[PDB]
Amino acid sequence: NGCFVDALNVVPHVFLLFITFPILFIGWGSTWLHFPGHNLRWILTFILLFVLVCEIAEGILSDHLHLYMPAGMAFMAAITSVVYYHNIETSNFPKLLIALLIYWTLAFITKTIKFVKFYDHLRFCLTGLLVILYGMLLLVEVNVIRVRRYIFFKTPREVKPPEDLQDLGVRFLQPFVNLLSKGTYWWMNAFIKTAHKKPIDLRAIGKLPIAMRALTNYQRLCVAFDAQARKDGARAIWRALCHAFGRRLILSSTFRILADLLGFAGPLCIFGIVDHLGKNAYVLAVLLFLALLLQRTFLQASYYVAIETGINLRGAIQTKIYNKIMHLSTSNEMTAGQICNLVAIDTNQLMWFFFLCPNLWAMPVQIIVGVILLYYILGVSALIGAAVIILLAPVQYFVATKLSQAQRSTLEHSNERLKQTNEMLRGMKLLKLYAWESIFCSRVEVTRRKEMTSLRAFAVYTSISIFMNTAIPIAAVLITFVGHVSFFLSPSVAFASLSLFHILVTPLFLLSSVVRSTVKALVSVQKLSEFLSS
Amino acid sequence: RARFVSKKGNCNVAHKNIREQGRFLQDVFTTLVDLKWPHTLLIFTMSFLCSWLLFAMVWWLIAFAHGDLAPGEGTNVPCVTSIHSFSSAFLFSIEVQVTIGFGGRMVTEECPLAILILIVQNIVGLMINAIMLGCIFMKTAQAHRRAETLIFSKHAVITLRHGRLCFMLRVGDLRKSMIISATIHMQVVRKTTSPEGEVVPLHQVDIPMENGVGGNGIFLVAPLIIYHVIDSNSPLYDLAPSDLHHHQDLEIIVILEGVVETTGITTQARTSYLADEILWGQRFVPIVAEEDGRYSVDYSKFGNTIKVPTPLCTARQLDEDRSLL
Amino acid sequence: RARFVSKKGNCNVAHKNIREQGRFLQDVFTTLVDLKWPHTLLIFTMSFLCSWLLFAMVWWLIAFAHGDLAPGEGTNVPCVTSIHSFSSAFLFSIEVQVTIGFGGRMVTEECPLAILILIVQNIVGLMINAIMLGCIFMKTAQAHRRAETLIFSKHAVITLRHGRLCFMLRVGDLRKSMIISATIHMQVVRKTTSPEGEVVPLHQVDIPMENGVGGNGIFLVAPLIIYHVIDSNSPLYDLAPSDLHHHQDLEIIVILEGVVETTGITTQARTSYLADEILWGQRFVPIVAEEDGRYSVDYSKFGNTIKVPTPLCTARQLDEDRSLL
Amino acid sequence: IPWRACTKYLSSAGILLLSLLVFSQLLKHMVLVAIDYWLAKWTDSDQSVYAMVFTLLCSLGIVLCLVTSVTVEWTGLKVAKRLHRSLLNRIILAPMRFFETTPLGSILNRFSSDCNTIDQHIPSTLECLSRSTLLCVSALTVISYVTPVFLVALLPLAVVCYFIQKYFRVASRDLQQLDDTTQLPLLSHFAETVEGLTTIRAFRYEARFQQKLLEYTDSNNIASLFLTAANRWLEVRMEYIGACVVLIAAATSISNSLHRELSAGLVGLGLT
Ligand SMILES: Nc1ncnc2c1ncn2[C@@H]1O[C@H](COP(=O)(O)OP(=O)(O)OP(O)(O)=S)[C@@H](O)[C@H]1O
Ligand SMILES: Nc1ncnc2c1ncn2[C@@H]1O[C@H](COP(=O)(O)OP(=O)(O)OP(O)(O)=S)[C@@H](O)[C@H]1O
């Protein structure tokens, strides 16, 4: 009785979609309360979305409406569960939660019946995954009733919605929104729309949450520094920062590596589609859509978490070196300029290096996966190509260094020019009282030519950089395809190689800047340690 | 500048940081009886269609499960005679739910499970019909529209009556139907600083309406100018006539309450007059006129105003001059 | 210690030895319209099922008695065509009662007794349907939930305003919908002994709410601190500031009444403040703030309080010092 | 900023190099698309002649790229030269009362930075903007040619981007300047503490000054944080649309170019 069990599955989705509509229509016609398992709930709901897409794929492969309707109904049921949970996060209730719990139990029952009747005789894996996900969501609901007040004894002892991010006027609410918007930044729609009309200012801007201030980051950093110095330096301050900023950085890094994996994965499903049509493809197309959106979302969340950790670190070490400025001795002009450079360039170097920290961990796995993937698509010839592109990464670095050198020289000349100007724009009446102005303008132009001369070499190096940027992509395909067929090709192979070439060219440039930033940050932290410990 | 309550009678102050404990939905039907008509009609049709589709699905399933859905001649009688597909099942659901009872498809005495589904279908249908009638009727006692028909003059003037400064404002009715026992609560708001150093952002204070021996309420047949006399005890008594037009921030609101005749509900109307809306030293034009055998009221001159040669000075200084004259 | 009425607004005093003369049930529907929703829904389904089963039994019996129940071909026509067993009879009862009218089983013009049973079945059905709709609608005018949405600050403070001792308490609204003509009845209770040797266990006395020229009522848009001034005539005027926090037993309750707009019913809210809840010499933080073009109200500071350097002394001794200063 | 500033900037270069830059860029992008267009016909299977044509296209691409880069370099340097000389000459012939009226900071500052800023960043950023816009136009034209119908589906979404553009800039500029402001009094404050350090440690005013510095660093962080939040917003939304377009392109390619079109060399270019 397969159709019978299909209908029995369709029923509970219908029940929930029908109870959701009155409440959703009343709610559709400023305190955020969060419950334990919220993030777990949303993660599991996205996994449900994915498995439901797979079930729809199965239903397309089989076709019999009644045989693939259960997926199309669970889709709206999960979306309506999301709508319910949004309506509960916005206003708490003990009853709406039970309304979810009933549906979870009934869906679990139907899935169990499906599993048994299948065991007695692709479907197997999908049904099992759905069973596991529904069970985990059930356990989450049981946790929620165990926490505060589903039925439990009389009073919830309810939390008292968090005043950190919800009390008196604050505008940057990142930690206090729905875990979907924590990814897609939906809370910025209101800000940006209001910003279009009225000019933004510090009165129109928010105030930083208690999760990120000078005091909070300074507290964590000084606690780590204390726990490290009680066990007694450059390595000490380093490990102190490391243990102080902890989980956020590694979380960003793992977001980043998973995104890198899915990005390396995209072109392979492209390849599969191209193969299938030349000789099971709609599924690959929708999977490509899903993988693209998920990969890019994870990449962006990674960027943001890293940036926020870096901003925390900048605030922390800034207020710390200001705290040190109070206890220093008078015997230690040049030190003042060194101090203000220690805040204007050294701290910015530290913070931008902390921006680029997860990229330094995620780059090697990216190039490794790239080379191993292209080898299995083009064979030995691939290896040759895989060399050429990689050879651009060290060369780039060299080029960059030359730029820096040039920059230094140019800056020198520029400074001198400014001096020869500051006089003329002060002795104005003196200058024009006898018209010696052209005589000084000749000298000013004499300086300018030297400045121009430096700029030629700088722009030549810039030109070489821009040239290599788009030359190596062409050269890779040239020396690879000519060196593969006519030396040693379905459209899929060539186009997958093209995609991988671009997906590998994009990260390669960043490794050079990462290396420069890392060495400069190491030097700047040695400097900060020498200063902070005088 | 910011206004307290708008001219139309709606409230301006936007609320922030409401610790919602859920009472906003806990008022389940006293919430939606507030709504507009399109939303309430939408949610009523959605209630009805939701219930109908739910039971149509369960009936489709029960006819499928008994096996009466499998087309076969003999050896059975369907629990519901003449049922073939989902469509006819949904037709049966709407046939029994909303109590039309077509009877082309007959539920039979062979299956007691169908008896149970019917005996719950009908009671839930009747309960949701009962609430969806009571709440729409509780709605049609929305008489705020009768709060719309009342009107006040756009700006209010002050004058000198009986040797004392006075302020005059108009009101009036717009239909034949009277409003029972209307009362006037006339209030003034101002950012005030106490002698104790306490500053309030807004300070409501009652200014009396001056009728016979006492009384808070009035009788509305024709447009009646409401007549208060500011005295040294009154809170408004201290201001100056040249500082009101531009700078000062003084909202004078009036709240007229009263129960309409036919529905019996108690409605009210609220309006504000700003420091830039009010003006000084004028007089309204007489509306009522002895016509052929009755009193004709002309609403064209309702907001009309004539100049009057009255002295212009502050009520404090005017009281000091009354002490001098 | 024992409280008079609880914070939630429910009454605490448990009644004992009520000479029940039966009026508790004599209010038959004004009793059950008070009940919760599950109990009222239970008793409504039980009313309906009771009536349906009663008439299904009587119909089963009448078809049995006529002999039309005895399956036979010819020499008769059943009073109700196509009736076989009790199940089909109960199906006929629910078919004619709740006015679906399936018509598979036809009541015929051969037996006038069946005509009588139908002509009483339908009228009793219609009457019990009429009451079971009117009472559920009379229920959906439960607006006590709107008595839930109102809020008062947890504790009340006293201050010195205009050179005289004052007590300040907050109130406020939680929805867009206004409350018409709300009035404040502010009462104090205390175990009192008269000079005649009479001791009362509890003694309610009105303490005035101090508005403009008079008036018992207020206007609620934004959170308005209610402002009373205790004077030598006031009953609360005699207490001491150090004896209130721990020992004395003084409940100050406030009862705010008002009719909600949309339903028109008159609701109220009641709250108590104990001698241990109230505190001395403080000031609330200003809620209302001039935002972009409006007034923003922040309910986070609703219950917030700041210290104020005010003299601490008894109102009697403070009045004596005012006589001295 | 209007087109007049850029018009004067490029007219200082002259008609000699303007077209030499623009047409060379157009031709480089045309070669970069045509190589893949010919590879599309290369795929299905004269393989040797095909590979030789591929080699010819690959050589044309790199030669043209080198030419374009050298053009941008030479033009930028000439423009900087002429602009500096003209600025100096025009400042020389000014009346004395003009020099006395205008503060020294503004007159000196333009030469100090404007000149430096332009020389350091205008050529590279201009080259990058040109390459980006032409690559985007080329990609749109490719996915249009590959799918006759996909074109008609992509013009709606692109119009969406227009609405995403305005709302971004009118804020992204604003926040930007705010950042600059919160950076200026902070650093200066630091310096004030260093010089008058003895006076501040004497008055025992260390607490209030530490409070002020926490205030300033918070005002800096809120700005530098909202800026990255807005950049993330624009990024994610533009990316969601860039994924919608590839979804629709692949969905049209699998059916149109296989079922009825019966062409496989198309879907490759479009998907890639
Ligand atoms: N314990 C009680 N509980 C509730 N109601 C009562 C109670 N006692 C009396 N009543 C009613 O309320 C009124 C109070 O009057 P009472 O105290 O009973 O004096 P009474 O003269 O004895 O009147 P009775 O008891 O009816 S003969 C009476 O009229 C009763 O009807
Ligand atoms: N921001 C708010 N919005 C709406 N209602 C509130 C808010 N804060 C409190 N309330 C309710 O109204 C009353 C005001 O008292 P409060 O200012 O909260 O003092 P409280 O002692 O902290 O009481 P709590 O918050 O319930 S422990 C409380 O009893 C709350 O139930």
Author numbering:
A (entry chain B): 24 to 52, 63 to 96, 103 to 160, 167 to 277, 283 to 329, 354 to 406, 411 to 566, 571 to 616
B (entry chain A), C (entry chain C): 32 to 356
D (entry chain B): 996 to 1040, 1060 to 1286
Give me lines lifted from the publication on this model.
The second structure is the KATP channel in complex with ATPγS alone, which is solved to 4.4 Å resolution (abbreviated, ATP state). Therefore, we applied ATPγS, a slowly hydrolyzable and functional ATP analog, to stabilize the structures of the KATP channel with and without GBM. The overall KATP channel structure and SUR1 conformation in the ATP + GBM state is almost identical to that in the ATP state based on our density maps. In the ATP and ATP + GBM state structures, SUR1 is in an inward-facing conformation. We observed ATP density only in the NBD1 degenerate site but not in the NBD2 consensus site, which suggests that the degenerate site has a higher affinity for Mg-free ATP, and ATP alone is not able to drive the dimerization of SUR1 NBDs. Here, we refer to class 1 structure as the “T state” (the tense state) and class 2 as the “R state” (the relaxed state). Instead, they possibly reflect the endogenous mobility of the CTDs in the Kir6.2-inhibited state, because we observed similar conformational heterogeneity of the KATP channel in the ATP state and the Mg-ADP state as described later.
ATP-sensitive potassium channels (KATP) are ion channels that selectively allow potassium ions to permeate the cell. Specifically, they are inhibited by ATP and activated by Mg-ADP. Previous studies have established that the functional KATP channel is a hetero-octamer composed of four inward-rectifying potassium channel 6 (Kir6) subunits and four sulfonylurea receptor (SUR) regulatory subunits. KATP channels in pancreatic islets are composed of Kir6.2 channel subunits and SUR1 regulatory subunits.
